[PDB]
Structures are given as C-alpha cells and as structure tokens.
From Swiss-Prot:
UniProt-annotated binding residues for a protein: G124, K155, D231, Y271, W322, W323, N324, D329, N357
Record entry for activity regulation: Inhibited by 1,2-dideoxy-2'-methyl-alpha-D-glucopyranoso-[2,1-d]-delta 2'-thiazoline (NAG-thiazoline) and O-(2-acetamido-2-deoxy-D-glucopyranosylidene)amino-N-phenyl-carbamate (PUGNAc). Not inhibited by Streptozotocin.
Region (Catalytic domain): 116-397
GO molecular function: [protein]-3-O-(N-acetyl-D-glucosaminyl)-L-serine/L-threonine O-N-acetyl-alpha-D-glucosaminase activity; beta-N-acetylglucosaminidase activity; identical protein binding
Parent sequence residues shown: 25 to 609 of 737
Its EC number(s): 3.2.1.169
Annotated organism of origin: Bacteroides thetaiotaomicron (strain ATCC 29148 / DSM 2079 / JCM 5827 / CCUG 10774 / NCTC 10582 / VPI-5482 / E50)
Record note on what altering N357A does: 95% decrease in activity for pNP-O-GlcNAc
Annotated active site: N232 (proton donor)
Protein known as: O-GlcNAcase BT_4395
Length: 572
C-alpha cells in the first residue's frame, strides 16, 4: 500500500533482505536532500540521480518524461532510484522509504509522475494563524506526501496585505520566514509568498515600484515563488485590464530577470461561478505562464467536469483550483474530519494546480491534506475511504481505531450560510432510524438496533478516554480535547437514555436527573471552550447522534408524563 498511489507499479511477489554492505554510486551528482534521506535509511549496488547523470545512464530510457517523475527499481540484482529531475529523486526516495518495512524490500518496478502539476495547501483561512513549529511540521509532512506548493498567505499578517506590504519584515520575522524557506527547500516544497496590496488602491507609479522592491526583498530572503491576491478586493481596481497589466509587468520585469522563479499565481476578484466579461479579459490579456486561482462553482463547492469546463473556456488556460476543505473559519464550532470526496476523478488535465484551504488546526487538517495529496497526485487511483483510513493511521497509529471512531462522528458542518454539508455517522444511521420509528409510534423496538446503539456509545466512551491521554501526537490531542470531552459526554448521555428506555420509577427519575446534568455539562463546555467572535462553542455528532438522543429522550419523557401525570421538562 503506497500513498500517493503511483502511476505504474509492478510487484514480483517476493521480498529482498536488507543489504548490510552496499556500494552506493552517484551520490556526488544526485539530489543532496534525497542522498541524506537515503543515508538516514542506511555489496549491493544502489544507483541514484537525475536524468543525465552518469549513475543513471543505464536507466534513462525508463524515466517518465514528466516533471517530478521518477523510476524506482528494486530487485534481486541492485536498486535504482532515478529521477526525471532533482525533485523526482526526492519523491522516489519517499516512495522507497514507504516500501521499506523492518529491513525488507519487495521486488518492485515503479514508474511515477504527478497527474496535477501543482499540488498543495494555501494558508488563507480566517482565524488564528499557525505557529512557526506547526508550519515546519506541515512543510515536512507536505514533503513526505509529495506535495510541492505551500501558499503562505495568512489573513492576519500585516506585511503581506494592506497597508504594510510596502514595509520590509522585521529582522526576527524575516529570520522566521528565512527558516521556513530553508525547510521548504530542504523538503522540495515551493514557498509561494502571497501579497494582497488592495484596499482601494488606485493605480500609480509609486505602489508598483514598491511592489517590485518588496519582491526583490523577499527574493533576497530566498523566496522563489510568488502570488498576487485580489480575493474580493474591495478596491476600485477590480478593473480586469489593470490587474492583467500589473501581473504582466511584474512578470516582464521580475520573473524574466531572476533566474529560478518557479510559480507566479494570481487570484481574480471573481474566484467562483456564482459571483459573476471579467474572466474572459483576464484569460485573454494575461501571460501564459501565470496561473489563475479558482474555488469551484460556489465559494465552497466541489469540482465537477461541468464545473471546470465552464471556466476553462474563459481563462484560456488550465485552472488553478483552490478547494475550501476542511477550512472551518465559517463553522469553527464543528470539526471537519470527514473524508475528502465529491471532486471528479478524471479531470487531471483540466487544472494546473490544486490547493486546499485547511482548518486553523493543522494536525486536524492533516487528514484532508493527506487525502488531497493522494488525490491530486493520482485521481484515477484515488480510493476515498482507504485513503481516509490511511491518513488516520499515519497521523495516530497507536490509536488509529479510536481516532477513526471519533472522526466518523465529526464530519458534518451543521447548518451554515454556505450550505456546505458532509456525510456523518452513516453506519449507525439505519439503526437510529429504525429505532426512532419503532419508538416514535409506541411500537416495540428492534433488539439488534438496541445492541448496536449500546456498542456505539460504549465505543465512543472508550475512544474518547483513549484519545484524551495520547502522547504520540500531542498537538492533535491539544487541538481536539474539548470536542473529545463533548463527545464523551454525548456517549454518556446516550448510554443513560438507553438505560432510560429499559425502565421502575425511581431508576427512571435518577437517569432523568443524570441526563439533565449531562446537558448542563454540555452547555458549560459550549460556553467555556472555543470562544470566538463568530462561531463560539463546541459541537459534535450533530448529524445523527444528538438528534436521535434528543428525540428518544423526548419520546420516553412524554410517555412517562402521560403514564404518571408528570410534567417533566424535555427541553434540550
Ligand atoms: Ca544532478
């Protein structure tokens, strides 16, 4: 099982023992980073290098003729880790490290190349920006998962947006960005520095030269990939040709002069189909090498063939997709740990790049980031649920099943203004529906469904109490602790309701008081944890579990009220 799935893979159904002694060749001309990654994993011959080096002269024919492609041959004879370019060798080494298990290697032959040219993440979400260490871990994760594009565009940074983009970075923040670029180059990831100079910027001669000066400064810091954002810029510079001429100018002056500029991206004022003459002029009057960002048919929507062919006509170039998942700046009381799906699996040629907008929690976003890194590399072989489970195991192997059980019930976004929903709590939904139908009409409940609900609530309690004390991935646990508390409380309330449907009178009253106390606990967590201006509080399992619990509670409470002339408060 390899991730992301390679294009062509041949397995010989036989294993090869570890070479205790080896004679590696080509280390002086291959990628030094891949050389270090290889030596950290360490007679038998091992050849490694980019196409054209003497070490891989024998295997230049088998190299895929695509950027970031590689050829990896492990057999009884020797080992070949050849790459189409310097980044392809690093990706080959990542796949090779995936192949190694307990010092044994399968006899395989792999030819690989990315399906989408640019793949990665953009840190454009509203809310608390990531820490420096979190960004370093994210860069290393991207490098391990064959992602190449990280767009540094945090909304709460004054030096890349209005009005301080003209200012140089302070020496300390400049050193921080320098170490970011250093780690990115160490793991072969394009640090795309974003800038958004809008705010009603009527064009002139000063501001453009200040843009060029800031670009030269960031180049002095080591940045080699840049992007200009007009994302709903309220500027009167929503004029199409003004933006087109500005981007053409910065390409004509800064890109052609500088030797190793990699990416040049721009985001139009209209980045979705619902917010629309503008994109046509943009695509006609822009340089061919510059990319144009896009988010889909809506502000937060999936990518369909009719949703991409409709735009690729206007911009006259392959789109640079910007998916808004699992970003939760519009519903941050919920967790979005559901699987990545909905995008068509056969539109790789219709887009230049695919970048995801993640949550304010990085380790929690790693699930969808892993899924996108697999899908953006090979949409034809993108297994949705298997990749989701593989991401869960990769992030927390010690508690893979527990994190799986938790994420299964934290997927839906709940009601919101964008109308974006996610499927959640599916495997138990038929049991919940059958049980609520059996008790809503006063009939007899199915026993198998009762045992299933017991098992689910017990497993929720177990998974919550296991996740609370995990230390293998501490940042993740620190991110999801309040939601795990609410999850455990929901499991306990459901367990007590399941004991309430099997009644004497005093036992029922005790369980009723217990359920009320648990609702108070939930309100306390809602009013204390995750306090933000827009969507404060903590919510979990709101798709199936919470409605089922509330409805069963109300049903049994009304039955008791009409059976004993009581007037219990069934409000939740
Ligand atoms: Ca070389």
């Amino acid at each position: 099982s390899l991730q992301p799935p390679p294009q062509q893979l041949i397995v010989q159904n036989k294993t090869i023992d570890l070479p205790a002694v080896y004679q590696l060749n080509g280390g002086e001309e291959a990628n030094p980073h891949a050389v270090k990654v290889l030596k950290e994993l360490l007679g038998m011959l091992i050849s490694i290098g980019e196409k054209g080096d003497k070490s891989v002269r024998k295997y230049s024919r088998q190299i895929p003729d695509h950027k970031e492609g590689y050829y990896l041959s492990v057999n009884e004879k020797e080992i070949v880790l050849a790459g189409n370019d310097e980044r392809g060798t690093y990706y080959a080494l990542q796949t090779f490290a995936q192949l190694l298990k307990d010092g044994k290697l399968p006899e395989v032959e792999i030819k690989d190349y990315p399906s989408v040219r640019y793949r990665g993440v953009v840190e454009g979400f509203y809310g608390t920006p990531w820490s420096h260490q979190a960004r370093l871990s994210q860069l290393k994760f991207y490098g391990k998962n064959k992602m190449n594009t990280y767009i540094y565009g945090p909304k709460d940074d004054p030096y890349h947006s209005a009005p301080n983009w003209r200012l140089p970075y302070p020496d300390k923040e400049a050193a921080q960005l320098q170490e970011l670029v250093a780690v990115a180059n160490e793991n072969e990831v394009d640090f795309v520095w974003a800038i958004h100079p809008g705010q009603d910027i009527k064009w002139n001669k000063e501001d453009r030269d200040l843009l060029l000066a800031k670009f030269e400064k960031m180049y002095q810091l080591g940045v080699r990939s840049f992007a200009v954002f007009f994302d709903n810029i309220s500027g009167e510079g929503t004029n199409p040709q003004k933006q087109a001429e500005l981007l053409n100018y910065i390409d004509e002056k800064f890109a052609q002069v500088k030797p190793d500029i990699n990416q040049l991206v721009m985001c139009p004022t209209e980045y979705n189909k619902s917010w629309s003459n503008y994109l046509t002029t943009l695509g006609d009057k822009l340089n061919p090498s510059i990319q144009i960002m896009w988010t889909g048919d809506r502000v937060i929507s999936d990518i369909t063939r009719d949703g991409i062919s409709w735009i690729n006509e206007r911009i006259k170039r392959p789109a640079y997709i910007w998916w808004n998942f699992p970003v939760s700046d519009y519903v941050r009381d919920h967790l979005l740990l559901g699987p990545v799906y909905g995008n068509d699996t056969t539109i790789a040629k219709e887009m230049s790049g695919f970048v995801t907008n993640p949550m304010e929690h990085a380790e929690s976003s790693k699930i969808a980031i892993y899924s996108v890194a697999s899908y953006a590399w090979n949409p034809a072989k993108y297994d949705t649920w298997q990749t989701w489970k593989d991401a869960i195991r990769t992030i927390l192997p010690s508690a893979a099943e527990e994190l799986e059980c938790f994420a299964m019930h934290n997927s839906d976004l709940g009601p919101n203004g964008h109308g974006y929903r996610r499927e959640e709590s599916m495997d138990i939904q038929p049991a919940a529906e059958r049980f609520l139908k059996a008790f809503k009409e006063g009939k007899n409940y199915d026993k198998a469904d009762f045992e299933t609900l017991q098992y689910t609530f017990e497993r929720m309690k177990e998974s919550a109490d296991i996740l609370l004390m995990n230390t293998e991935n501490k940042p993740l646990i620190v991110e999801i602790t309040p939601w795990v508390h609410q999850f455990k409380l929901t499991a306990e309330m459901g367990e007590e309701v399941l004991k309430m449907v099997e009644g004497n009178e005093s036992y029922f009253l005790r369980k009723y008081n217990h359920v009320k106390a648990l609702q108070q606990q939930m309100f306390y967590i809602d009013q204390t944890s995750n306090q933000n201006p827009y969507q404060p509080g903590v919510k979990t399992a709101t798709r199936v579990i919470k409605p089922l619990i509330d409805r069963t509670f109300a049903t049994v409470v009304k039955f008791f009220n009409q059976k004993f002339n009581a007037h219990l408060d069934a409000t939740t």
